[PDB]
Amino acid sequence: VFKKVLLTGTSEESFTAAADDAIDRAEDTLDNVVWAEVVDQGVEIGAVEERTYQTEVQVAFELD
Amino acid sequence: VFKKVLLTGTSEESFTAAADDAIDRAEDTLDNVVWAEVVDQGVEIGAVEERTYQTEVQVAFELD
Amino acid sequence: VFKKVLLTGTSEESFTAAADDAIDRAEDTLDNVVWAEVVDQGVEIGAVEERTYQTEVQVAFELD
Amino acid sequence: VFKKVLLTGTSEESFTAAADDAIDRAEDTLDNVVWAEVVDQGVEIGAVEERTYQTEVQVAFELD
Amino acid sequence: VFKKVLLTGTSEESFTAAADDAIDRAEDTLDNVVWAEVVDQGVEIGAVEERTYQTEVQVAFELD
Amino acid sequence: VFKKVLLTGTSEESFTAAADDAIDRAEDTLDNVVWAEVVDQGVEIGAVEERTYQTEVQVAFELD
Amino acid sequence: VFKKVLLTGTSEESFTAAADDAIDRAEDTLDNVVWAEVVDQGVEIGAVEERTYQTEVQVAFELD
Amino acid sequence: VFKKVLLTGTSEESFTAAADDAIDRAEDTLDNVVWAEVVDQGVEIGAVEERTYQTEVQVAFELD
Amino acid sequence: VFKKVLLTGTSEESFTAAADDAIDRAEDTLDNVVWAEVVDQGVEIGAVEERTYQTEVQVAFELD
Amino acid sequence: VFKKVLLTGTSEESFTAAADDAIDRAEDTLDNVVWAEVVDQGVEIGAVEERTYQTEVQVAFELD
Amino acid sequence: VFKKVLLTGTSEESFTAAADDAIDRAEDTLDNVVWAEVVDQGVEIGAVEERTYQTEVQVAFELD
Amino acid sequence: VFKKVLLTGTSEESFTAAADDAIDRAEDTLDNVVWAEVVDQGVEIGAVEERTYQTEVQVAFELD
Ligand SMILES: Cc1cc2nc3[nH]c(=O)[nH]c(=O)c3nc2cc1C
Ligand SMILES: Cc1cc2nc3[nH]c(=O)[nH]c(=O)c3nc2cc1C
Ligand SMILES: Cc1cc2nc3[nH]c(=O)[nH]c(=O)c3nc2cc1C
Ligand SMILES: Cc1cc2nc3[nH]c(=O)[nH]c(=O)c3nc2cc1C
Ligand SMILES: Cc1cc2nc3[nH]c(=O)[nH]c(=O)c3nc2cc1C
Ligand SMILES: Cc1cc2nc3[nH]c(=O)[nH]c(=O)c3nc2cc1C
Ligand SMILES: Cc1cc2nc3[nH]c(=O)[nH]c(=O)c3nc2cc1C
Ligand SMILES: Cc1cc2nc3[nH]c(=O)[nH]c(=O)c3nc2cc1C
Ligand SMILES: Cc1cc2nc3[nH]c(=O)[nH]c(=O)c3nc2cc1C
Ligand SMILES: Cc1cc2nc3[nH]c(=O)[nH]c(=O)c3nc2cc1C
Ligand SMILES: Cc1cc2nc3[nH]c(=O)[nH]c(=O)c3nc2cc1C
Ligand SMILES: Cc1cc2nc3[nH]c(=O)[nH]c(=O)c3nc2cc1C
Ligand SMILES: [Cl-]
Ligand SMILES: [Cl-]
Ligand SMILES: [Cl-]
Ligand SMILES: [Cl-]
Ligand SMILES: [Mg+2]
Ligand SMILES: [Mg+2]
Ligand SMILES: [Mg+2]
Ligand SMILES: [Mg+2]
Ligand SMILES: [Mg+2]
Ligand SMILES: [Mg+2]
Ligand SMILES: [Mg+2]
Ligand SMILES: [Mg+2]
Ligand SMILES: [Mg+2]
Ligand SMILES: [Mg+2]
Ligand SMILES: [Mg+2]
Ligand SMILES: [Mg+2]
Ligand SMILES: [Mg+2]
Ligand SMILES: [Mg+2]
Ligand SMILES: [Mg+2]
Ligand SMILES: [Mg+2]
Ligand SMILES: [Mg+2]
Ligand SMILES: [Mg+2]
Ligand SMILES: [Mg+2]
Ligand SMILES: [Mg+2]
Ligand SMILES: [Mg+2]
Ligand SMILES: [Mg+2]
Ligand SMILES: [Mg+2]
Ligand SMILES: [Mg+2]
Ligand code: NA
Ligand code: NA
Ligand code: NA
Ligand code: NA
């Protein structure tokens, strides 16, 4: 059985790096992370000093 | 990093109140709740005494 | 077996009340109405005296 | 010919009131507003004093 | 309030059995499981000995 | 001209059998049933003795 | 309250004419037909003498 | 950079002609119109003398 | 077994004719073409002498 | 690099078996078939002796 | 009230840079730009000297 | 007439580079490649030494 957690990563650099940021967090807290699916991308502009790229991913991990 | 939990709130009054019901529950159990996105709305009719409005939300919270 | 009818309710008050308007009509004409799923919401503005909220629902009822 | 503008209204009260807020703004600035279609709903929580309901609408107006 | 967890069940037999596999896991770990919604189906072919059917479900459970 | 009716079939056995259950009901009541399109699948768990598979289909029939 | 019926019209000429074919049938059988929304278009090729254009519409009519 | 405007054209003749009607209006008011994407089609029936075909398009134009 | 090829037909006349253009090409190169499903429509404007209607279809053909 | 082919399998038995039918055909003609994604399911009723279940899959295979 | 404009940015380098290109243009012409949502990505190949990455964004700005 | 092939490119570097990988393969094997549309993005994690970014594109090419 796989389970997914819905995470939004952030980066001041790129959408790829924002995806990595979410996956990094999943790997800190979960064993057996196997894949991630991008489900949204966006940019925060008017509440941050530098534009912040966001990539939302479903991060799948194998249970057991 | 943000994480989302998928909650369905209920209310005998309105769709807004049902959304609030889900957010209230998230705030009971989670720190740093920042926003909610409505993803579905419906009404339970034929298993309840009064119509029950349901609003499903992804509730986002900031990790750390 | 359940069947669904696709109804758009209207209200001069709210989206919840417009959903109720559709369900009320289903209950006038059908037995065993069990749930409704919201599939669209909108507002009629430029052909009515007061803004009219519309909520489109699939209204499910149990056959037999 | 109709044209649509994509507006997000806000309210501290309800999703209906947030939709009205967007339509009110369109009517301040545009003639011949005829209808609005709801395309998204959400709630701002962690940057405001009170929860703020948001309703995004395509607001249609007739040209000429 | 209901909460959903996003699980992918697997089976070497059928899509129904894969859905059951996810629900079985939810019921091992959660009280008050009430329904599941199928959101995806697929087949793993080129990393397994026998084709493996997968069914992804949102599994809803009632909180409290 | 074809018309579609939106039916949810049920089965304690499988998603295929649930689809058949809806089509069977359509064929009891309608002439010239020609095809069905699956539009949703789910499982009722926490209001039934045995898990109940549901398959929602648009069932098309030819008019005249 | 509005209700919608899901009809597929056919024509050997065009997608517009196929939409008209469905609306014509609705108007034969229903009062107060007010609008139609196109939801699908296709072409039957390998079971007919001439290509047959199909347009599926939700046809809305006002109740009462 | 391209920008899109969301226009609904109308015609008493066809969906193609309704798309053209929107593009014609864009070309009256904008330079460098480059393409249009159809996003919806429908028919107004019960507020007009003759059925009116509508085609909604995103009309793209190049900035500068 | 059916297979689909994803083709975009073009016409200076209409969306129907653009769909036909894609199907014509499929029939030049493939046996047992049975149906086509429209998946997109658009108009090329700013790289052609006359507006060019495009209709994208999945064209299904029976294998063997 | 992976490539996908869009195949509709058929079976007189089940949706799973129809998916298998498409994958079987891909494996007859292609090396390195790795996975399949279900994209549609339906039932042919009024042109066959027995109901025919159809499952449409994107079948992925690794190039080289 | 927020308003969105639908812009396609371009870059010979990356999808992130193409998103930035659209946001840069919005910021040249608009006050109070607050966020952008990615809605499409693509690559122009056969009308340019170098591949051109395109990212379409809804760019939101606060009115007043 | 345009045709599309559905390819998933891979890269250990970025989503843009993964899109390029698919387009490169199309250009090795096909004449008149004109554009690509991104349809999915994901990351392989738990079967590779380094995270592998994947970008799925429909790659369009002009026939003849
Ligand atoms: C980065 C980002 C910020 C946002 N802020 C937002 N802020 C807000 O008040 N309402 C919104 O709907 C909203 N959407 C956002 C979407 C994205 C992708
Ligand atoms: C409130 C609600 C109840 C429902 N009950 C349901 N009960 C059921 O047996 N099958 C369903 O698919 C189903 N759907 C529902 C959807 C909603 C929104
Ligand atoms: C309330 C409402 C009215 C509308 N009127 C409409 N009137 C019209 O001529 N064309 C349309 O597409 C249209 N859409 C509508 C949508 C809504 C939600
Ligand atoms: C109200 C609202 C705020 C939001 N803020 C947001 N803030 C953010 O940093 N990223 C987001 O994606 C985002 N989405 C939002 C969506 C909504 C509906
Ligand atoms: C079973 C399955 C395996 C998959 N493997 C996969 N492997 C991969 O490298 N990339 C993918 O996008 C991918 N998708 C898959 C989807 C399904 C449904
Ligand atoms: C079987 C089934 C039951 C359900 N019950 C439900 N019951 C409920 O109170 N709210 C829901 O949204 C809901 N959804 C359902 C969906 C499915 C598919
Ligand atoms: C016209 C048309 C015929 C079709 N026939 C079909 N015949 C079939 O056996 N399976 C299908 O999925 C199918 N789809 C069709 C779709 C369209 C639009
Ligand atoms: C032409 C058209 C008219 C419409 N009128 C409409 N009128 C209305 O009162 N409510 C609606 O939702 C609505 N939708 C429409 C859609 C279309 C496509
Ligand atoms: C006809 C047509 C041309 C287009 N050109 C295009 N040209 C371009 O540079 N970027 C695009 O996204 C794009 N989209 C198009 C869509 C359509 C339907
Ligand atoms: C099995 C099947 C047959 C079909 N036949 C069909 N036949 C037809 O004339 N028009 C259609 O749209 C159509 N759709 C179909 C869909 C399915 C899934
Ligand atoms: C970059 C790009 C170019 C395009 N050109 C295009 N050109 C065209 O003639 N028809 C199209 O549909 C089309 N689509 C496009 C999409 C994209 C994303
Ligand atoms: C990279 C990738 C791998 C995957 N592997 C997968 N592996 C699997 O067993 N089941 C899946 O559904 C699946 N999906 C995937 C999706 C992506 C995008
Ligand atoms: Cl828009
Ligand atoms: Cl989710
Ligand atoms: Cl329907
Ligand atoms: Cl495809
Ligand atoms: Mg930096
Ligand atoms: Mg988002
Ligand atoms: Mg009360
Ligand atoms: Mg729901
Ligand atoms: Mg009042
Ligand atoms: Mg609607
Ligand atoms: Mg207040
Ligand atoms: Mg939104
Ligand atoms: Mg076995
Ligand atoms: Mg999946
Ligand atoms: Mg049994
Ligand atoms: Mg359902
Ligand atoms: Mg003729
Ligand atoms: Mg169809
Ligand atoms: Mg005329
Ligand atoms: Mg519309
Ligand atoms: Mg001509
Ligand atoms: Mg397209
Ligand atoms: Mg048999
Ligand atoms: Mg299909
Ligand atoms: Mg360069
Ligand atoms: Mg696009
Ligand atoms: Mg490297
Ligand atoms: Mg994918
Ligand atoms: Na989730
Ligand atoms: Na817009
Ligand atoms: Na219906
Ligand atoms: Na394809």
With contact defined as beta carbons under 8 Å apart, do J40 and F38 qualify?
yes
With contact defined as beta carbons under 8 Å apart, do C34 and C42 qualify?
no
Non-local CB neighbours of E47 within 8 Å, separated by 6+ positions = J34, L47
Burial C30-55 (b: 16+ CB within 10 A, else e): eeebebbbbeebbbebeeeeebbbbb
The pair of structure tokens assigned to G48 is: 């007919």
Phi-psi region of L45 (alpha: psi -120 to 50; beta: other; left: phi over 0): alpha
Q: Which ligand is nearest to the CA of J35?
A: 5
Minimum-distance CB partner of E46 among J19, J32, J37: J32
The pair of structure tokens assigned to K39 is: 């809605």
Q: Number of helices (H) and strands (E), helices first, in chain B?
A: 1, 3
With contact defined as beta carbons under 8 Å apart, do I2 and I62 qualify?
yes
Residues of J within 8 A of E16 (CB-CB) are 16
The residue count of chain C comes to 64
**Structural domain of residue K2, as residue ranges?**
1-64
The number of angstroms, rounded, from the C-alpha of L12 to the middle of its chain's C-alpha atoms is 14
Does any ligand 2 atom lie closer than 6 A to the CB of residue F54? yes
With contact defined as beta carbons under 8 Å apart, do D35 and C45 qualify?
yes
Give the residue from G45, G52, G55 with the most I CB atoms within 10 Å of its CB, the best one to mutate.
G45
Supply the DSSP symbol for J41.
E
CA I27/CA L1 separation, integer angstroms: 13
Chain I: residues touching L (Cβ < 8 Å): 5-10, 21-22, 25
Q: Residue D20, SS3?
A: helix
What residue ranges line ligand 7, CB within 6 angstroms? Answer: G 42-44, 54; I 35, 37; J 42, 44, 54
Chain D: residues touching K (Cβ < 8 Å): 5-10, 21-22, 25
The number of angstroms, rounded, from the C-alpha of C11 to the middle of its chain's C-alpha atoms is 10
Burial A7-45 (b: 16+ CB within 10 A, else e): bbbbbeebbbbbbbbbbebbbeeeeebebbbbeebbbeb
Non-local CB neighbours of I49 within 8 Å, separated by 6+ positions = none
**Residue nearest to ligand 7 atom 7, measured at CA:** J44
∠ at Cα A11 (A7, A12), nearest 5°?
155
Supply the DSSP symbol for A46.
T
Backbone angles phi, psi at F36, to 5 degrees: -135, 145
CA F17/CA F6 separation, integer angstroms: 17
CA C51/CA C44 separation, integer angstroms: 6
Non-local CB neighbours of G43 within 8 Å, separated by 6+ positions = G51, G52, G53, G54, I19, I23, I35, I36, I38, I57
CA F53/CA F45 separation, integer angstroms: 9
Q: Which residue of I has its CA nearest to H27?
A: I45
Beta strand ranges found along chain J (DSSP E): 2-11, 33-44, 52-62
Instruction: With CA atoms as reference, report the closest residue to H2 among J38, G11, K39, E17.
Output: K39
Does any ligand 9 atom lie closer than 6 A to the CB of residue I39? no
Instruction: With CA atoms as reference, report the closest residue to A7 among A45, A38, A32.
Output: A38
The residues pairing with D64 across neighbouring beta strands, listed in sequence order, are none
The residue count of chain H comes to 64
- F24 sits in which H/E element: helix F15-29
Minimum-distance CB partner of I46 among H15, H20, H32: H32
Determine whether the interchain pair A22/B6 forms a contact, defined as Cβ–Cβ distance below 8 Å.
Answer: no
Q: What CATH number does the domain containing L55 carry?
A: 3.30.1660.10
The pair of structure tokens assigned to L26 is: 């199309």
* Residues flagged as binding site of J for Mg(2+): 13, 40, 50, 56
Q: Which residue of A has its CA nearest to E52?
A: A1
The pair of structure tokens assigned to C40 is: 């669209």
CA A18/CA F21 separation, integer angstroms: 47
Non-local CB neighbours of E49 within 8 Å, separated by 6+ positions = none
Burial J12-46 (b: 16+ CB within 10 A, else e): eebbbbbbbbbbebbbeeeeebebbbbeebbbebe
The pair of structure tokens assigned to G36 is: 């139609």
Q: Residue G57, SS3?
A: strand
The residue count of chain G comes to 64
Q: Number of helices (H) and strands (E), helices first, in chain L?
A: 1, 3
The pair of structure tokens assigned to I14 is: 């209409």
Class of residue G44 by CB neighbours under 10 A (exposed 0-12, middle 13-18, buried 19+): middle
- I57 sits in which H/E element: strand I52-62
Chain C: residues touching F (Cβ < 8 Å): 1-4, 6, 58, 60, 63
The pair of structure tokens assigned to H26 is: 């864009």
Instruction: Give me the torsion for CA of A58, A60, A63, B3, rounded to 10°.
Output: -30
Cα distances (angstroms) measured from residue J20 to each of A62, E51, G4, J8, K20: 25, 9, 37, 10, 45
Q: How was this structure determined?
A: X-ray
With contact defined as beta carbons under 8 Å apart, do F55 and F7 qualify?
no
* Other beta carbons within 10 Å of I52: 17
| Amino acid (1-letter code) at residue K39 | V
Helix ranges (DSSP H) in L6-62 = 15-29
CA A44/CA A12 separation, integer angstroms: 10
Q: What is the resolution of this structure in A?
A: 1.3
The residues pairing with B57 across neighbouring beta strands, listed in sequence order, are B7, B38
CA atoms within 13 A on the CB side of E44: 15
Instruction: With CA atoms as reference, report the closest residue to L39 among L53, L23, L25, L55.
Output: L55
Minimum-distance CB partner of B3 among A7, A10, A21: A7
Please identify which residue in the block is written with the tokens 């940019």. Answer: A43
Q: Which residue of D has its CA nearest to C49?
A: D34
Instruction: With CA atoms as reference, report the closest residue to C45 among A46, D6, K54, D30.
Output: D30
CA A54/CA A2 separation, integer angstroms: 24
| Amino acid (1-letter code) at residue G7 | L
CA J17/CA J23 separation, integer angstroms: 10
* Other beta carbons within 10 Å of H1: 18
**Residue nearest to ligand 11 atom 13, measured at CA:** L35
Q: Residue D55, SS3?
A: strand
Chain I nearest-CA distance from J8, in A, is 5
Determine whether the interchain pair I35/G44 forms a contact, defined as Cβ–Cβ distance below 8 Å.
Answer: yes
CA I43/CA C18 separation, integer angstroms: 38
The residues pairing with D7 across neighbouring beta strands, listed in sequence order, are D57, K3
Chains K and G touch (3+ CB pairs under 8 A): no
The pair of structure tokens assigned to C32 is: 């065993």
The residues pairing with C48 across neighbouring beta strands, listed in sequence order, are none
CA I59/CA I56 separation, integer angstroms: 9
Q: Which ligand is nearest to the CA of H37?
A: 9
Q: Number of helices (H) and strands (E), helices first, in chain A?
A: 1, 3
What residue ranges line ligand 5, CB within 6 angstroms? Answer: E 42-44, 54; J 35, 37; L 42, 44, 54
Does any ligand 4 atom lie closer than 6 A to the CB of residue B37? yes
With contact defined as beta carbons under 8 Å apart, do I26 and I61 qualify?
yes
Candidates A39, A54, A57: which one to mutate for ligand 4, based on the most atoms within 8 Å of Cβ? Answer: A54
The number of angstroms, rounded, from the C-alpha of F32 to the middle of its chain's C-alpha atoms is 16
Non-local CB neighbours of D14 within 8 Å, separated by 6+ positions = B14, B16, C14, D53
User: What's the distance, Cα to Cα, between the start and end of chain J in Å?
Assistant: 8
Supply the DSSP symbol for C1.
-
Backbone angles phi, psi at L54, to 5 degrees: -125, 135
Supply the DSSP symbol for B20.
H
Structurally, chain H folds into a number of domains equal to: 1
| Amino acid (1-letter code) at residue J52 | T
Atom index in ligand 2 nearest the CA of residue B42 equals 18
Please identify which residue in the block is written with the tokens 């996908």. Answer: J4
The pair of structure tokens assigned to L23 is: 């387009």
CA E42/CA J36 separation, integer angstroms: 5
Atom index in ligand 8 nearest the CA of residue C52 equals 9
Non-local CB neighbours of D59 within 8 Å, separated by 6+ positions = D4, D5, D6, D7, D22, D23, D26, D30, D33, D35, D36
* Other beta carbons within 10 Å of G47: 9
Non-local CB neighbours of F44 within 8 Å, separated by 6+ positions = E35, F10, F51, F52, F54
Atom index in ligand 5 nearest the CA of residue E40 equals 18
CA G15/CA F60 separation, integer angstroms: 19
Determine whether the interchain pair G8/F6 forms a contact, defined as Cβ–Cβ distance below 8 Å.
Answer: no
Chains A and L touch (3+ CB pairs under 8 A): yes
**Residue nearest to ligand 6 atom 18, measured at CA:** F42
With contact defined as beta carbons under 8 Å apart, do I34 and I2 qualify?
yes
With contact defined as beta carbons under 8 Å apart, do K57 and K19 qualify?
yes
Residues of G within 8 A of I23 (CB-CB) are 43, 45, 51
* Residues flagged as binding site of B for Mg(2+): 13, 40, 50, 56
The pair of structure tokens assigned to F15 is: 């998603």
Beta strand ranges found along E1-64 (DSSP E): 2-11, 33-44, 52-62
Q: What is the DSSP string of chain H?
A: -EEEEEEEEEESS-HHHHHHHHHHHHHHH-S-EEEEEEEEEEEE-TTSSS-EEEEEEEEEEE--
∠ at Cα C7 (D39, C29), nearest 5°?
160
The residue count of chain E comes to 64
The number of angstroms, rounded, from the C-alpha of J54 to the middle of its chain's C-alpha atoms is 8
The pair of structure tokens assigned to H27 is: 């070309």
Supply the DSSP symbol for G17.
H
Q: Residue C12, SS3?
A: coil
CA E2/CA E15 separation, integer angstroms: 25
Chains that touch E (3 or more CB pairs under 8 A): A, B, F, J
CA B33/CA B40 separation, integer angstroms: 20
The number of angstroms, rounded, from the C-alpha of E58 to the middle of its chain's C-alpha atoms is 8
Helix ranges (DSSP H) in chain G = 15-29
| Amino acid (1-letter code) at residue H9 | G
User: What's the distance, Cα to Cα, between the start and end of chain B in Å?
Assistant: 8
* Other beta carbons within 10 Å of I38: 24
Instruction: With CA atoms as reference, report the closest residue to E18 among E46, E34, E39, E47.
Output: E39
Q: What is the DSSP string of C25-62?
A: HHHHH-S-EEEEEEEEEEEE-TTSSS-EEEEEEEEEEE
Backbone angles phi, psi at I60, to 5 degrees: -95, 135
User: What's the distance, Cα to Cα, between the start and end of chain A in Å?
Assistant: 8
CA G8/CA J12 separation, integer angstroms: 26
